[PDB]
Design a protein around this nucleic acid. Structure first.
Ligand code: DGT
Ligand code: MN
Ligand code: MN
Length: 175
DNA sequence: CGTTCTATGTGTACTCAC
DNA sequence: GTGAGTACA
DNA sequence: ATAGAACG
């Protein structure tokens, strides 16, 4: 069920105004500023296996509800797997079935989440390997030295990459 | 000593014993 | 409930 | 990125 970069962007553009979740009866819309395209789509690969969306949820209490009660106005989908942090959907788009992957992160995690979910995997592996040799650990939630969050005065992914000590490259060029 | 090749990470969701 | 183990972000 | 191993 493969698709083009253009089809990818069409769908993401369509979902951007339509994602919401049920929170104890009421239907809360997810805001565009908290929807970030990730994976191969953000890396502008000509062909994609799926669409990967990162949702930034504004508080920890809400994690229990967003993905497990995710809603998409006017589009039929089925749920393959679903937990608080990762959700996989099969959506119907123009009489065709496409795979939509949803992930979640808290605001304090945004740049780590983006850095992780942008990929590619081989780039994650090598960046992390390097940090391990200097006794740091990195993941989707933060940077670490001996079980402790390194507080970093940074907001964007670019700021994080440069803080970590690596060449910043646009997603297309990461490898 | 230099060139080149190779290997490498960290966490989530689900299922199935006991 | 906990923990082993697979599949896979 | 980086470091070890095989090769020159
Ligand atoms: N596949 C995979 N992805 C990971 C892993 N760790 C972090 N990720 C992140 C980086 C990936 O780009 C992102 C989405 O995974 P996908 O498997 O959808 O791959 P991606 O979109 O790069 O390419 P594709 O979907 O294959 O066109 O999740 C991992 O171990 N495996
Ligand atoms: Mn993908
Ligand atoms: Mn994916």
């Amino acid at each position: 069920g493969m698709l083009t970069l253009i089809q990818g962007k069409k769908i993401v553009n369509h979902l951007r105004s339509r994602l919401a979740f049920e929170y104890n009866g009421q239907l809360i819309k997810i805001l565009s500023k908290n929807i970030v395209a990730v994976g191969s789509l953000r890396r502008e690969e000509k062909m994609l296996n799926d669409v990967d969306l990162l949702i930034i949820v504004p508080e920890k209490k809400l994690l229990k509800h967003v993905l497990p009660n995710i809603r998409i106005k006017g589009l039929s989908f089925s749920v393959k797997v679903c937990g608080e942090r990762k959700c996989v959907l099969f959506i119907e788009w123009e009489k065709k079935t496409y795979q939509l992957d949803l992930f979640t992160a808290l605001a304090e995690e945004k740049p780590y989440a983006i850095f992780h979910f942008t990929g590619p995997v081989s780039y994650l592996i090598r960046i992390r390997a390097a940090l391990k040799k200097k006794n740091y650990k990195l993941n989707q939630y933060g940077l670490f030295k001996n079980q402790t969050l390194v507080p970093l005065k940074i907001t964007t992914e670019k700021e994080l990459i440069k803080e970590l000590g690596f060449t910043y490259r646009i997603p297309k060029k990461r490898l």
